[PDB]
Design a protein around this ligand. Sequence first.
Ligand SMILES: O[C@H]1CC[C@H](O)CC1
Lengths: 1042, 209
Amino acid sequence: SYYHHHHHHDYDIPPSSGELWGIHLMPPRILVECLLPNGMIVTLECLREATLITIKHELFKEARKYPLHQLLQDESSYIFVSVTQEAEREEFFDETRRLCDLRLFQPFLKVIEPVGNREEKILNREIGFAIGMPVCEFDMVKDPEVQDFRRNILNVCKEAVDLRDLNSPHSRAMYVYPPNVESSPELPKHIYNKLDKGQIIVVIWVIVSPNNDKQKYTLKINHDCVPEQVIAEAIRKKTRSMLLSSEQLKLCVLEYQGKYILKVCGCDEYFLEKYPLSQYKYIRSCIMLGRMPNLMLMAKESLYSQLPMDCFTMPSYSSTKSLWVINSALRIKILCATYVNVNIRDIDKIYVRTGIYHGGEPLCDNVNTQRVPCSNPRWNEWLNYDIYIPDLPRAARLCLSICSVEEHCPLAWGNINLFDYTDTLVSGKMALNLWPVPHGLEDLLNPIGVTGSNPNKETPCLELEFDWFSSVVKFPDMSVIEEHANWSVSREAGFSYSHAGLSNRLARDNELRENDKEQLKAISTRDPLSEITEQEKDFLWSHRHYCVTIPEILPKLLLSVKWNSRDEVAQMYCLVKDWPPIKPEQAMELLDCNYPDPMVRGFAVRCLEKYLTDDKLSQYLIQLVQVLKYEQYLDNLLVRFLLKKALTNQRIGHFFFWHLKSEMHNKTVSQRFGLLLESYCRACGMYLKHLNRQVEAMEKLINLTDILKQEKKDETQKVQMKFLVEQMRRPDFMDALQGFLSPLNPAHQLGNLRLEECRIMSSAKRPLWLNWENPDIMSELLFQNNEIIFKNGDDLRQDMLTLQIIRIMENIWQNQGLDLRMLPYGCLSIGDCVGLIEVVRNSHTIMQIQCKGGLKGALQFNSHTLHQWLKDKNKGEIYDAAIDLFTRSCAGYCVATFILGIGDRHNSNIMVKDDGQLFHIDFGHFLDHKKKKKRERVPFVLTQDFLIVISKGAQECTKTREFERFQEMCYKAYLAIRQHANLFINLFSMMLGSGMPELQSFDDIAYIRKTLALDKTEQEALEYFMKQMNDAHHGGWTTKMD
Amino acid sequence: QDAEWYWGREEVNEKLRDTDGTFLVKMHGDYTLTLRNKLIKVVELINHYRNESLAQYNPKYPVVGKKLHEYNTQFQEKSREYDRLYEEYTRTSQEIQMKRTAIEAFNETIKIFEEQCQTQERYSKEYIEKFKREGNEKEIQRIMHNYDKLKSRISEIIDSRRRLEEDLKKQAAEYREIDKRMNSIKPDLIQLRKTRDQYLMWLTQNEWL
Ligand SMILES: O[C@H]1CC[C@H](O)CC1
């Protein structure tokens, strides 16, 4: 009756390692084989947590009691060495290190006299720990490019380190502690109005004798006055006296004035150059949060006291035929895919598909015939490509893929640069090991995949052969391409008076039409995804010379060039040579996959070098590290840019380290990023040692959560938590998890752990809630305790991006004068699904609000409870502002959410703060990843709960002015973002690199088009949004302010 | 109006996704021809160009409600199966490589012990021949005891490695077996997926989905 008695007969109810190989956490007591110089083994029993100093010191006592003692030197003549889990022979110089922390593979220690006269140099260990792969792993890479990268990139490192010791010690201090400054000194109109006519009360602190006692000095100075001005005013007030005349004050100010700089009380930030106070980020937060800034007068020679020297040393490792001469078309010999995993049952026949590419194809795509199908597959064809060898553009690439049979289906793919990094057309035999097809890719060929072979051996190795021209064929010089252009253009001037397909060339001459000059700028403003027709392409390409008037057209123009015509391409290289520079936000487009050319990308880097500020760089750093993947060659201008900014400003450096290090698991970038990270680590200065303490911290937490998630599952939180605390007590953890800098923001130091507050959260993933003491001198003035969540299970980098996107949305809105406080809490991926999330204290899930306001007998939860709970928290004039905040926050998060189309959101992932700000967490899938199963969804659906709060407290909340205000915010926000839709496209476009399933190819990003309504006009877009907002709510939004 | 290929961007590219030669058709333009993806800025003009090429104009294939729920639950079942097996694939890829590194480590470890039993031979049998009579059976046993550890230990390590190597092959077998099935699922994933969109196309001429 239930199941028509149908029986399902089939149905039946029945990670990297840590401290030693195959075991997460070495036993508290353990036996280690000590291999001595005299050939004797002595097995020492000794504790997990014991140093090598202790182990050595004991070993040479216990050795005496074994034969051949007199054949051992003093213990001090020796250094331990063993095989590690990365499988190299590591020498153990830092004998303070603990037996558990050595990453030992087998528990044994060989005794030796130290090999290298340069012990200094064998602290490459520090580098490959930071990197998470030993440096020696690079020295035995055969590949010239790699070696060449390594030697050539030191050019950049040297130049960086030069910029640093320029005005030592100030510039060193300037490196380490770069000023944290908002973009523009101009203040928004709503921030100003919080100042009673341009002035902030500030509080400067001082420390006297014995250095324990502290002293307030509450100034009221102009917002735009600078650190040096502020430092004077403090020292004035500090040292006025009845014993000092007026003129005698000035003279004691002037000696004192610049022996000090301004710290921020409670965190390692400083105000170290000529900047409006307002412009430092700390100040402008205080203004918005209604807070009185607390700075500290810090004595330069106590600050410069703490800064080291960088200590940079150079590493140990310190006739041709022009392409266009080649009179032939391209042909490539396929040979034999040696390995394949196919059922001869299920699959009929298999072939190799092929194509040449520049992001898009420059010839008809082709295959070889359906041969030796499945069983032992081989074809010995010459594929013949209809493009002449001189019309290959610099950046050209073969893209191939073995396939199955309209039963068309990919098996294994791989791409090859037709030119090597030395400009040399590829000729001879190649071994190309292939990549598996990703999730979302059903397509046959995959050209936005990685250029290069898989390093993995046991993979479909499709080998092949490239036509040979008796000589190393090279790509022509610029001198040569410049002349070909000049001749191609002097050639154009005298053509047959009429030319058909008039698309080719002008026919208007030095007088182009005015109706046309209007069609061009209307193209120029259309977003990067609004695909451009063949008419428009040709039309753009013809007027290319007028296009220099509208520089921002460039992205479109470049996608109109026929890259398979060296005539066109050569000409386009001369436009680009001295094309007018463009805005960094617009030039970023040109470093995505759609622009693989080295001159184009070179241009974009020149834009950034000029216009892109260390502020804006570090906002978009995630997109610039991602976009490195689409650079053909290791060594390039973009890499040289970033690496130099990294070594110039330690706040960039920090994230640049972690973003690279984050993705080291991913073999599509391990080589590239590892190599770059080597450079950074070799030249970044003492921060390496700081970074290594963060790196060692995270590994310990990684191992801790690894054991919780396996074997310690199916135990009560009780049992786990007792294990957690037990473990965190052991010395190795105390050592490792206390004296360091938050990766979330290294300006915050993390002191001792308070284990009282350290706990496992309730989630299945066993995320850790960690709490640290703020060991700042003025800790109390900022926060005495600092807590962040470590999460072993989830891929944080989707969230990382939306939090970025929000942050940017906030800035757009506010810096256009319209206050919509968002809360883009800190997030950071540091590994394969490993990360850190900034805790926001005094915030609760709406669910919590409702369980804490739910009445005795179960019944149902009350809509007002949120409001009543909020009222309880904000009483008086304080109430009224808290609603405006909830409203301003609820508006921004409504629009951001809807545009991004994030996961549906409900009581257990919306959060309200005591002070009344709403903010979202756990975004999950962003560009509507779950639609795969024209939904144009509203993820933030405002129930009564929210509406009640929005209109100060009422029944039928749809009909209050308060709500009409709220909507009007939602519309003015919606549109302001719409006007910067180019950026948002481009931010998502640059992230196609990373293997996020939610960013697979450009139509993924196309959601943001429909939702922003870019094809329509803005008045329609407004209405589209109201239409969208009305049917999710069922009322309110079509009316117009009655 | 019906006009087959004529519909009248996002869903243009999605209908164009996986099909070479296939096509379909205010103050900006009117009707655009998206020939696979080449956009070209009514029934008169396309009947000419289905017969003839587009080179002479510009130098360089005119393609129930409960069944939607039934074929959607197959597709969504198959996608998990595909998603499951792609982890099993990627995990095994890792686990395998972790073994290979371990095997290198093992080998490298063994070297140090082979080197050690050798190293001891040198200094032990230099100290047998010097003296001989002094501490004769006493010394030489307690040196031979230590040696008989060193070698029988090496023995375990070489067994420890072998055991790993044999596991690597079974792992590699299973690794092959996963890709194999993936490659047989993959074609039939697409046909399920493709028919689901033709079924859902005819209707438009959530609770199921
Ligand atoms: O028109 C085509 C569509 C796909 C893009 O990524 C490249 C150009």
